[PDB]
Scaffold this motif. Structure first.
Motif, mmCIF file in Angstrom:
data_model
loop_
_atom_site.group_PDB
_atom_site.id
_atom_site.type_symbol
_atom_site.label_atom_id
_atom_site.label_comp_id
_atom_site.label_asym_id
_atom_site.label_seq_id
_atom_site.Cartn_x
_atom_site.Cartn_y
_atom_site.Cartn_z
ATOM 1 N N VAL A 188 60.788 44.910 46.905
ATOM 2 C CA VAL A 188 58.798 44.811 47.200
ATOM 3 C C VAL A 188 58.135 43.391 47.532
ATOM 4 O O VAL A 188 58.268 42.101 47.178
ATOM 5 N N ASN B 266 65.885 46.916 47.446
ATOM 6 C CA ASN B 266 65.049 47.331 46.428
ATOM 7 C C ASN B 266 63.584 45.945 46.292
ATOM 8 O O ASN B 266 63.364 46.031 45.858
ATOM 9 N N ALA C 116 73.722 39.862 47.442
ATOM 10 C CA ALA C 116 74.455 38.519 47.711
ATOM 11 C C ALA C 116 75.971 38.616 46.360
ATOM 12 O O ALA C 116 75.233 39.147 45.172
ATOM 13 N N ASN C 117 76.981 38.793 47.343
ATOM 14 C CA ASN C 117 77.934 38.913 45.966
ATOM 15 C C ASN C 117 78.291 40.181 45.342
ATOM 16 O O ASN C 117 77.814 40.673 45.008
ATOM 17 N N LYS D 36 52.611 31.656 37.095
ATOM 18 C CA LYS D 36 52.799 31.975 38.237
ATOM 19 C C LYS D 36 52.746 33.604 38.913
ATOM 20 O O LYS D 36 53.392 33.938 39.931
ATOM 21 N N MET D 37 52.923 34.263 37.419
ATOM 22 C CA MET D 37 52.635 35.266 37.297
ATOM 23 C C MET D 37 51.493 36.485 38.420
ATOM 24 O O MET D 37 50.495 35.775 37.286
ATOM 25 N N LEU E 293 54.936 35.736 30.878
ATOM 26 C CA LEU E 293 55.306 34.367 30.534
ATOM 27 C C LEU E 293 55.735 33.667 31.568
ATOM 28 O O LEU E 293 55.112 32.523 30.969
ATOM 29 N N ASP E 294 55.913 33.894 33.176
ATOM 30 C CA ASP E 294 55.083 33.087 34.185
ATOM 31 C C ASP E 294 53.717 33.079 34.304
ATOM 32 O O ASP E 294 53.067 33.933 34.508
ATOM 33 N N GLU F 79 52.818 36.106 49.436
ATOM 34 C CA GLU F 79 54.330 35.266 50.303
ATOM 35 C C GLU F 79 54.201 36.034 51.506
ATOM 36 O O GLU F 79 54.919 34.814 52.055
ATOM 37 N N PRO G 162 55.189 40.967 48.032
ATOM 38 C CA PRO G 162 53.669 41.077 47.800
ATOM 39 C C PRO G 162 52.980 40.140 48.352
ATOM 40 O O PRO G 162 53.347 39.278 49.665
ATOM 41 N N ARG H 203 64.490 38.025 51.572
ATOM 42 C CA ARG H 203 65.825 38.573 50.361
ATOM 43 C C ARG H 203 66.209 38.198 50.231
ATOM 44 O O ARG H 203 67.085 38.957 50.926
ATOM 45 N N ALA H 204 67.334 38.656 49.016
ATOM 46 C CA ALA H 204 68.153 38.733 49.467
ATOM 47 C C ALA H 204 68.626 40.501 48.630
ATOM 48 O O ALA H 204 68.912 40.275 47.791
ATOM 49 N N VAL H 205 68.888 41.381 49.831
ATOM 50 C CA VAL H 205 69.465 43.045 49.299
ATOM 51 C C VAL H 205 70.495 42.854 48.634
ATOM 52 O O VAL H 205 70.452 43.757 48.405
#
Lengths: 421, 421, 421, 421
Positions: free
Chosen positions: B285, B283, B268-269, B182-183, B179-180, B290, B287, B264-266
Motif C-alpha cells: 500500500v 500486501n 525478504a527472507n 510522522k504518522m 505513537l509515531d 511517498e 501512500p 518495498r519488500a514484498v
C-alpha cells in the motif's frame, strides 16, 4: 405518478422517476419509516439520519447520558428490507419527521426543544455533536434550525446530493450453500468506494521491560466512517535486535458511542526474528451484518511479549508500514456523505419521540421478483430537469430547507402545493 | 460569476459551476500556479502537465541531460494545498503558460523554441518523449504546436475530458492520533480506480549455481502510472526440488527519469520447502506522500539463495502467479488520463522558464471550513450545456486548441471576448 | 472634470468629485508619484502600497536579502506634501505602475517577474509575504496576478473601500512657537481610530538570581500597524516580597524589516516596595515624523535589578496589567486597511524598477491657501453613484481588477474608453 | 440572496447586503442564537437584548429575586464567536423569539406573561426596569407589547438605527507572544467612541478622626454603560495641612445586578505632602474579556489614613479633579444605543424560557480565513434603499413593530410574504 419536483419537495406524495440521463428499466417504490423512540434519563438524545442513503438505512438513535456520553439505541430503517427483494436502487426523495407524541404519566412538562443541522460530511467528521454545537456545523442558514418545540416537531427534507448517479447494489443475498448454518453470502454496494490510507508508523521505536502476558500499546486511532461492509489491507514490517519476541495484533472498529462494534485479530501470536524483516499483513473483511451501529473510528493494538523474561527483557522493536481501509461504495454520495442530525433536549424522561417518513426509490427486482415485476425506463417529460436545476439553483431565495419546523414545512405544502388538489 | 463557456475558454477569468447534471451544494475557487524554472546545462527540458487533474497537482518539470536522460526537477502545484481545506473537488477549467522570462547575464541568445502536444493517455503510455517525438503523439492538429519561440511562449488550455463526473476526494487528512510522530492518515481519491493485472510468471523455471549473498533476477518490469496512492496485491507460488533455499523479493516503483521513487519488500527472507507449494503474498500500500514524482513503471526483483552452498547449489525453482496493481481513482478522467507535454530546447542555460496559470474548481469544505463557507447548487442558466456541446462539437472548425502559441491565444481572447467588456 | 467612473477606472485621466452623500465645499487635485527604485544584491524585493491612503503616503520599498530578510529602502510618496497645503482630504481614485526600465551595463538578462496581491488587511496581518506566498493572501481571482514579466510591468488600480466617508485631516502643521527649534505641532488624522488592547500579564511571576546591570526579559510582543501617530496608554501593577528592586521598562516599535523604528522609556529606574502595589503607568505619544517606516509590531521590555546583590538576590516580582495602543484614524478605511503588495524577483541586480502613478483627491485648503483657492460642492450628475454601485456590484464579471498586467489594463483603457476620444 | 427588505423584515430568511453607500468588498453570514433559560424561584426575570449589536453579543439574562434584586444569569450570544474568524462586521438584520417551552414536572399552570419595550437608550439610562415599568419607557406604540402569553411568545425585530455606517472591528485577537500564558492581545471596536466626563470633586473638603486601617468614603458613583473594553483616565489633585497621610483609591465597575464586575486600584498607598499639590492620575484600561456582564455604573473609593494616629488625627484633605471614561466604539449605533427588554413574570419556577434567533451580517475575514473566503461589493439593485426609506418612513402606518406577539408577527410573514413562495 407525480412530477419529480412534487415528489422531491413532498416525498409523502409518492415516487417519480428522476429526470436525469441514467436511462435504466426500473420500478418505483415508497417505503415508510415509523418509530416511537423513548427519552432517556437525561431527557436529551440525538437522532442521526443518512438523508441520501441508497437503501433501507434511514438513521440511528443515540441517547445522551449523565457521563455526557451517548449510548446507541437502535437503527432507523425502512418498513421492509429492500435488499431482500431488489438488487439495485437509487433514492428519488425522502422526508422524515421527528416529534414527541407522549408525556410521562406523571408530567405536564411541555418540556422539549430540537436543534437540527445538515452536515456536508460523514458522521465521524463532525467537530462537535452537542445540542448547541450542531448549530454551527454548516454556514447555510437553510440547513439549520434552532430550538423548535418538540411538540411541534421538525421535518427533514432530503435535497439531491448529485444527479445522474448510477444504481447502487443493495446488500442483497447471493445464492450459496455452506457447511456453517450462519453462513452469509451477499453482493454489496461497491461502486464509488471510499479509501482511507493510514501510515501507522514510519520506523517507530518501541520499548518497555518484560511483563507476564506482555505489554500492550495502541499504535494508532483514526476516524473513519462505515455503515456497510469495509475491509482493511496493508502490511506492517517489524525489525528487532532482541530474540524470542512474540507480537500479537488486533484491530478495533468503534461505534459513535465509543463502544467497540467490531474486533479482529490482524495477527495474534507472531514470532519476531532478530535482524530479518518481519512482515505482518492485514487481510480483514468486515461484512455488513457484523456492523451493528455506525463505525466512527478504527484503532490498532499491538501486544508485544517475550518467550522467557525476568526483569530482563527491555523488549523493543521497530515498525514501519501503512494500511488502507476501503469502505465499499463509501463515496457514492449520500451513502455516507451528508448526515442530518436531530438533537433534542429537556424532553420528559420516558416520553416518546415519534419518527415517521417516506423514502422513494427507483429499483430493480431480484431474479425472483423480476418474474412478476415489470420494469420500464422513466416517463419522459421535458424540462423536468431544468426546472429542478432552476429550483435548486434558486434554492435559498425560495427558502427550500433540508431541516424545517414541521409547521413552516406544512405551510409550504400549499405555498407551492395549491395547484392540482 | 462568469458563463461556464467564458471560464472554460478563458480560465483566467474566474470560476463558474459546470452546467451538468451533477447537482451538489458546493463552492467555487480559483487557484494560481506560478513557477520560475531554471534551464539546465543542455538548454532543453520537459514540462509535464495533468490538464484535468482534480486537485492541486498541475504538473512536473524534468530537465534533459548529456546522457540524454531526464532528471526530475520538481512538481508544479496550486498556490495552496486544497486537500488541506476541502475534501471533495471537481475541475471546471484550467489555463497555463510556459514562457521564458530571462537571459543569462552573459548572453543575447534569443535561443529557445517550444513543442507541445496533448496525449490522450497516461505519461507511461507515450511511445516517444523527445522534443520532436512529441509532434506525432496525436493526430489532432489542434493538440500540437511546433517551434513556438520560447520568448513568445505557449498557452495550455484544458478542454473537458467528460462531464457529469462526480466529485473526487482530495487526499485530505482524516483525524487520527498515533505513537509515531510522522504518522499520516488521509481519505484518498478512490472512485474510478485503475487496475493493472500482471501475470509475473506461469511456471517460470529458474536456475543458477550458488553464490554468496545469492543471485538476483528482475522477474518483470511493466509500465504503470501513478501520482497518488496505489497498492499492489496478489501472490506468487513457488515450487522447488532443492532443499534449504531462502527467497527474498522486493518491488520497485520507478520515476519518469528512471530513478527509483519507491521500494518495498514484498517478502525478504523466505524459506522454500521442497515439494510443497510456497506462497508469497503481496500486501503493498503506497501512500501519496511517498510518491515524490510521477511513477512511470514497476518491477519485481527476486533474490534466491541457499543456506549452505559451495560450487554445489545449481539453485533452482519454479514460479507461477499474477499481481494486481490498483491505483485509486486512477481511471477518473484527467486524474492520469490526458497528459500535455511542453518541451523546450536551445534555451540559454541558466535562463528562467516562467510558468503561470489558473485552475478553477467546484469544492466542498472540510468540517472546519464548512462552518464559515456556505455552499450552493450551481446557478441555473438554460442552454449552457448545449452551447458547450455545440462549441466542443464544432471544436476543430472554431479552432479551439489545447496548446496555443500565446499570441494566437491572446487574440482569441477578443476574437470571442469582444462582448461584455 | 471627468465622470467619477472615468476617474475611478482610469485615474491618469484626472479627478472628479465622489458622487456620495458627503456634501462639503472642496477642491479637486491630482498628485503624481515617480520613483526609480534600484534592485538589490538578491534581485528580489517588495513594494508595499496603501491603495486607499487618504494622503501623500503611497507605499514603501523593501529589498530582500541573503539572510532572507527585508531591508527598508524608502517611502513612496506624492509629488508634493499635501499636509503642507491642505488640512482635510478624501481619496477619489489612484493608479500606479511598477515596471523595470533598465538593465545593468553588463547584462542582457530579460530577468524579472512580478507577483501582486491586494490583501484586505493591515501589513502586519499578512501571514506570508514571500514572492509566492502572496499568491494566496486573497481568494479573489481579480486581486492577484502571477509571474508578470517585469519588463511588461504591472498596474495597481485602487477600487473603493467604502463611500460616504468623511474627510480625513492630513498631518498638517498647526501654528505654534516654542523654545526648541525642532519643535513640531500638527493636527493629525483622528477620526475612526484603531485600538489594540494588550493584556501584558495577569499575575505573571518573575524570578532570576542577581546580576550586575540587571536581568532583562521581553514581557510581550504583538503585531500592530501604524504609519502615522499613535499612542500607548495603560498601566502595569507590580508586587514583590523582595526589598530594594529597581525596575526599568522600555517600549519598542519595530519596522516591517525587523528594525527598531522607535523606542521609548515607559519607566526607567523605578523602585519596588515590598507588599504595597507598584503602579507603572504608560503615557506614550509617538508623533508621525518619528515613524520613518511602517510599524509592524510593538514589544515591551522590563529590566529588573536590585540595589545591593551578590549571588544572593533571586530577584522576583509579579505583574498584572494591560495596555491600549491607539493609532489615530487607524480604522478609517484605506488608512491602514487594504495593502497591495508588489513582489519582484530574478530582476538584474542594479537594474531600475520604475514606479509611476496618479492620486486624485478632494481637498480643503489650509487658512493661507484658502484665500486664493475657491471651494465648491461636487458637480451633480444623477445616477453617478448607482452606476458605480452597479459597476462594482458586477465587478468580477466585468473583470475589474485591482492588480493588472499593464498590457491587459492598457487594453481595458479602450475596452471601456472607446467613447469620448 | 434575498432583497434587503425581505431580510430586514424576516431575518430568518437569510442575509443580504445593505443597500447603502458604504461600498466595501465583504461576505454575508447568518448566525443563530439558541438558549433554554430556566425560570427562577420568583418566576419572574428579564432578558436584555442589544438589537443592533455589531457582533456576537445578543443579550443577557437576569432573574428577579425575593429581595427584588436581579441576579445575572448569563450572556446570550451568537452560535459561533465571530471575532474568532472575522475582523470587521456590520449588522444587516436580526430577529429573536423569547417563549416558554416547558412546565415543571409538577405543574399545569399556563402561568406566564411577557412585557417588552425598545428603549432608545443604554441599559443604565432606563429609569425603571420593573415588569410594568417597562411599558412606559417609550412613547412609540409599536415598540411596546403588553401581557403576551408566555406560551405564545414574543418576537423581537431589529429595525435600523442608522445606515451608511462603517464597519466595526470585532474584538478579534491580534498575533502576539508573551511570558504570561493568559496574555491576550486584540484589536477592538474603536470607531465612534463614547465619552463620559466626570468631575469627581471641585475642592471637596474631607475630614474624619483617625482610625486603624483608615476611614473610607465613596467619592462618587455614576451610571455608565459598557459591554466591551473601556478605559478611565484623568487625575485628582489633593491638598492637605496635615502630615503623614497615606491615601488609597480604587475604582469599581458594577453590573446591572448591583454586583461588582470589575475593580481596579487607581492608586493604593499614596503619601500626601502638606502644602504641595498631590497628583493622583488614572490610567485604567479594562479589556473586554474582563467584563463578564454589562456594566451599568462606575464608582470611586478613597481610603484615607495616617502613619501614626491616636484619637488625634482629624485627618483631612481637599480634592479637585475630573475623570474621563471612554468606552471604545460606544457611540457606534446599536453598540450600546438601543436596548430591547423582554420581561416575564408569573412563569412556573423551573420551566424553560426558550430563546431562538438569527443575526445577519456583512463581514470581512481575518488573514487566515481570507485565503478561502472571497469577498465582493454588495449586489446592485436600484431603488432598494428608497423602498426601505419609504417603508421605514411609513413604518407606523404599516405596523412594523420591533416587539411583536409571535402570532401577529407570524401572520405578518405572509401579510407581506405572500409573494415569491
Amino acid at each position: 405518478i407525480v412530477p419529480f419536483i412534487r415528489s422531491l419537495l413532498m416525498p409523502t406524495t409518492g415516487p417519480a422517476s428522476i429526470p436525469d440521463d441514467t436511462l435504466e428499466k426500473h420500478t418505483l417504490r415508497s417505503e415508510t419509516s415509523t418509530y416511537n423512540l423513548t427519552v432517556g434519563d437525561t431527557g436529551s438524545g440525538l437522532i442521526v439520519f443518512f438523508p441520501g442513503f441508497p437503501g433501507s438505512i434511514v438513521g440511528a438513535h443515540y441517547t445522551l447520558q449523565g457521563n455526557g456520553n451517548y449510548k446507541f439505541d437502535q437503527m432507523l430503517l425502512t418498513a421492509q428490507n429492500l435488499p431482500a427483494s431488489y438488487n439495485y436502487c437509487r433514492l428519488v426523495s425522502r422526508s422524515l419527521t421527528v416529534r414527541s407524541s407522549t408525556l410521562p404519566g406523571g408530567v405536564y412538562a411541555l418540556n422539549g426543544t430540537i436543534n437540527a443541522v445538515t452536515f456536508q460530511g460523514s458522521l465521524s467528521e463532525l467537530t462537535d455533536v452537542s445540542y448547541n454545537g450542531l448549530m454551527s456545523a454548516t454556514a447555510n442558514i437553510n440547513d439549520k434550525i434552532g430550538n423548535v418545540l418538540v411538540g411541534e416537531g421538525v421535518t427533514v427534507l432530503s435535497l439531491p446530493t448529485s444527479y445522474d448517479l448510477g444504481y447502487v447494489r443493495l446488500g442483497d443475498p447471493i445464492p450459496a450453500i455452506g457447511l456453517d448454518p450462519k453462513m452469509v453470502a451477499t453482493c454489496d454496494s461497491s461502486d464509488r468506494p471510499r479509501v482511507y490510507t493510514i501510515t501507522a508508523a514510519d520506523d517507530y521505536q518501541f520499548s518497555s521491560q518484560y511483563q507476564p502476558g506482555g505489554v500492550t500499546i495502541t499504535l494508532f486511532s483514526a476516524n473513519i466512517d462505515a455503515i456497510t461492509s469495509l475491509s482493511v489491507g496493508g502490511e506492517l514490517v517489524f525489525r528487532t535486535s532482541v530474540h524470542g519476541l512474540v507480537l500479537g495484533a488486533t484491530i478495533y472498529l468503534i461505534g459513535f458511542d465509543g463502544t467497540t462494534v467490531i474486533t479482529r485479530a490482524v495477527a495474534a501470536n507472531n514470532g519476531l526474528t532478530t535482524g530479518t524483516d518481519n512482515l505482518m499483513p492485514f487481510n480483514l473483511v468486515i461484512p455488513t451484518n457484523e456492523i451493528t451501529q455506525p463505525i466512527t473510528s478504527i484503532k490498532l493494538e499491538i501486544v508485544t511479549s517475550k518467550s522467557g523474561g525476568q526483569a530482563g527483557d527491555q523488549m523493543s522493536w521497530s515498525a514501519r508500514g501503512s494500511l488502507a481501509v476501503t469502505i465499499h461504495g463509501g463515496n457514492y454520495p449520500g451513502a455516507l456523505r451528508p448526515v442530518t442530525l436531530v438533537a433534542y433536549e429537556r424532553v420528559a424522561t420516558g416520553s416518546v419521540v415519534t419518527v415517521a417518513g417516506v423514502s422513494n426509490f427507483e429499483l430493480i427486482p431480484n431474479p425472483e421478483l423480476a418474474k412478476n415485476l415489470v420494469t420500464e425506463y422513466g416517463r419522459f417529460d421535458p424540462g423536468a430537469m431544468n426546472y429542478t436545476k432552476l429550483i435548486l439553483s434558486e434554492r435559498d431565495r425560495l427558502g427550500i430547507k433540508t431541516v424545517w419546523p414541521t409547521r413552516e414545512y406544512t405551510d409550504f405544502r400549499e405555498y407551492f402545493m395549491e395547484v392540482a388538489d
